Design a protein around this ligand. Sequence first.
Ligand SMILES: [Mg+2]
Ligand SMILES: [Mg+2]
Ligand SMILES: [Mg+2]
Ligand SMILES: [Mg+2]
Ligand SMILES: [Mg+2]
Lengths: 140, 140, 140, 140, 140, 140, 140, 113
Amino acid sequence: PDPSIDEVSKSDWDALTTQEQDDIISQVENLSSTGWVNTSRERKAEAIRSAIAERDTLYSGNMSRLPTLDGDAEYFTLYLSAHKIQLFEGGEAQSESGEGGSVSYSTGGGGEKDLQKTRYGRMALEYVWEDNSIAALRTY
Amino acid sequence: PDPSIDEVSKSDWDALTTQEQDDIISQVENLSSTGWVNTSRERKAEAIRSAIAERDTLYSGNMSRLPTLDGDAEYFTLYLSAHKIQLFEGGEAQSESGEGGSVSYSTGGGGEKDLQKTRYGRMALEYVWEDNSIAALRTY
Amino acid sequence: PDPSIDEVSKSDWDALTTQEQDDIISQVENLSSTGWVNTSRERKAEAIRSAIAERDTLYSGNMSRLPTLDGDAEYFTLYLSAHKIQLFEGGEAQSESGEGGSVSYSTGGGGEKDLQKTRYGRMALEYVWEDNSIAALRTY
Amino acid sequence: PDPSIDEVSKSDWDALTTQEQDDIISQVENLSSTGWVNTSRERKAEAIRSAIAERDTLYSGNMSRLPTLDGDAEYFTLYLSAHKIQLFEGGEAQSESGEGGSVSYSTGGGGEKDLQKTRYGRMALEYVWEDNSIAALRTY
Amino acid sequence: PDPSIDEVSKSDWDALTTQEQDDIISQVENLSSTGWVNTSRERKAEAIRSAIAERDTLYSGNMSRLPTLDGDAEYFTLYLSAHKIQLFEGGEAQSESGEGGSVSYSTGGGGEKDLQKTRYGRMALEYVWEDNSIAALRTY
Amino acid sequence: PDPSIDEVSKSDWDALTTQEQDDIISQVENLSSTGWVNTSRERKAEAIRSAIAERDTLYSGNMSRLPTLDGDAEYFTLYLSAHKIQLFEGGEAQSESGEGGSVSYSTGGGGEKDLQKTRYGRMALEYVWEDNSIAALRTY
Amino acid sequence: PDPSIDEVSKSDWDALTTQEQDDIISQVENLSSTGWVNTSRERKAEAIRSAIAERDTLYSGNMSRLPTLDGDAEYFTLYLSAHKIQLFEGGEAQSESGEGGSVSYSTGGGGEKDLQKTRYGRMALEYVWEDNSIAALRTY
Amino acid sequence: NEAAINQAIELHGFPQRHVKVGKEDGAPVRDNDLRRVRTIFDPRTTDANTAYFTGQDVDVETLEAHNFDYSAIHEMDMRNLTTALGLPLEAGNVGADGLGSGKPAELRFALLK
Ligand SMILES: [Mg+2]
Ligand SMILES: [Mg+2]
Ligand SMILES: [Mg+2]
Ligand SMILES: [Mg+2]
Ligand SMILES: [Mg+2]
């Protein structure tokens, strides 16, 4: 996209053209083979706007004078977006069964924090020190 | 590929021809018997671009002057790509069933972390000290 | 084969004739009763090329001036290749069921780490001190 | 056989006549009621060649002034061959079912290591101090 | 039999007439109500020859002044033979099911070491101090 | 029987008339409602001969200045025989099912050792200090 | 019965008339609502004869100045007889089913040792200090 | 005995440093890696106020000096040698309790005279 998802804050996202938003949405839709085609535009836009806001608030600033977001901020925001889109539908699929036949995914077995609950969450989690508390400070 | 996958960063990948990208994609498609043929080209391109960026951000630099990426950076980037593609398709298949019959793929529960959760992840994980903190440094 | 799998590195594999590669592929195909006949040549070639590169980078050199690859480098590279081929196909089946006829293959939990997760890996693992670190050095 | 399986190394096995190899193969096939008759000659030859090489590399030498292979080297090499053949067919059948009726073979989960995973492995294991680290050495 | 199974070593077994071998095989066949009638002569002969070789190498010599085989060497060799006629046919039946008619054989998990894995092993194990390590030696 | 089962060693059992053996076999067959009627005479004779030899070798002599076989040697040898006959028929039925209906025989997993594994074994086990190491000796 | 079961030893049981034995058998048959009517006289007689001999050998003498058999020796010998009879036909039924009827009998694990494993055994066990080792002795 | 003590003091009288690298059941370290670790924690270039910074997966263990009573071995050696040579133990620079006063002292000097 022309503006990248890491180049925009919440107020910037609201200031984008519909085309620039749709380009970013189209990038997020690459992260699933299903593309989430049965969820409407407004909900994917809300998830992205939320991911932007949550990055800028919960995953910003320094920790032992390292950035708290160590990985690529583009892909972090995309994975955080995909995580939110997934949670706008349900959990991870543990099992899916059709008119006939079935598949099951071993998507469980992780911890209890939100990011631990889904595949996109578990990817995003690596970009941000795995939520580890490595901060340090001193008297001067 | 003429430019192999370790010769390029995110901004280089975006500057390659479609032919150079498609040959790298073709190499990644060797890592599964199913080739991920029913996932579109752009989704595989996104996963590769993401793996390139993630390597250069999360799996770069040194620990006690050892490189953080000990194994071949080619096969590491391919495995990291294949891991992401598999997550775009919803993760591992633990079991499958239908009029073709049924199969179960001996996963167990596995580990909690993303690279532990899929076979391509687990192959990539050996290249990077199994994500351990071997780093050591001194006053001088 | 005339050039043996232990005599060739990644660059050498790319320099071999198609027949020399095919002889080595034919040797690898001996390690399964099925021969993996429904997986294409390119995928078996990629698995072998990867196993060669992975041997040379992750399973090379020394610890305490013992070789880190203690066993026969021929059979190590073959078992490492067979491990890779099997992982290009979902891994080991714990069970296979068809037209009523059914079987289960006693794999069990099988640990968590890469080489533990399939039979060919479990064989290859004995060649490399079971991934143990007998490494030792001293001041002089 | 005229040259017994304990009297030959990998290089010697490659030097044997077809009949000498076939006598040894015929002896290995005695270790199963099913004889592995559906598996082809090349696969049984590969498993034997591998067992010979693996004996000479991983199960040669000494632990204290003891041999690391305490039991009969003939039967050890045969059991190691049968272990390999069984893994080439996918390992232990824990259970089988069909229009012939059904059976379960009391394996449990078993151990984690390759020799622990099959009956031929568990037999071979007793010949080699059960893989225990019993060696001792002194300064002089 | 005329020569008893405890009176012959591996080279002696090979020196016997077919009748003397068949008398011993007939004695071993007394140890199952099925008589193992669907397994060929060569395989029963191989199991006995293996039991003889394994007795003479793994279950010979002294542990303190005491012999390492305390029980009747005849019945030890017979049970060790039966333990090897089983395992040439898969494990013990945990359960068997025919045309609706079904049975389960109360084995439990038994243990981990080969002799623990079948009733004939579990009997033979009692003769050889249960694989216990009661050996002792002094300085002089 | 005129010669009792406790009065005969292995050498004596071989010297008995067929009628004297048949009297003793008939007494053993009293230990089951089913009589082991569909198991042939040779198998019952072998089990008895083995039980006699096993008593005289593994369950003979002194454990402190008292016998290792505390209970009635007649009934001990009968229980040891019945145990062996039951093992020749595959062990304890945990469960049986068919057009007669279904039954389960309350065993649980039991112990690990041979005498622990069947009801006749457990009956024999009380005669022999429950296989405990209760012996004591002194300097003089 | 005219001679009571507690008043006779093994040699006395062999000296009784058929009617005196049958009176005692008739008393033992009172301990089950089924009367064990499908098990022959010889097997009920053998169980009683064994119980008499086992009482006189394993459950006789003293622990301190206490008798090792504290309860009524009549009912002890009867319960010990019933225990043996039940073990001559598979032991406790955990569950029984046929023609669509079903029942389960709350037996549970039932410990591990001989007398623990059936209801008659558990009744007998209370008569004999629950097999506890309460004997005490002193120097003089 | 003097040679044995002299060697034993070097081996066991001085504490020694044991750097253990990598996690238990973790990825295996090779000796080409240990070369780089040794280059950092080198006692040749370490100083009294040095500080070490690591991830959780590196440990600096100590071979603590495995103390033994070489003083008593010296006293025994001197006891044996002096009394073999017929000298008083005091001439070997070794003392004793109680024997330093009164005629219990004088007897050794009398024996020497
Ligand atoms: Mg590893
Ligand atoms: Mg990580
Ligand atoms: Mg091993
Ligand atoms: Mg008792
Ligand atoms: Mg025992």
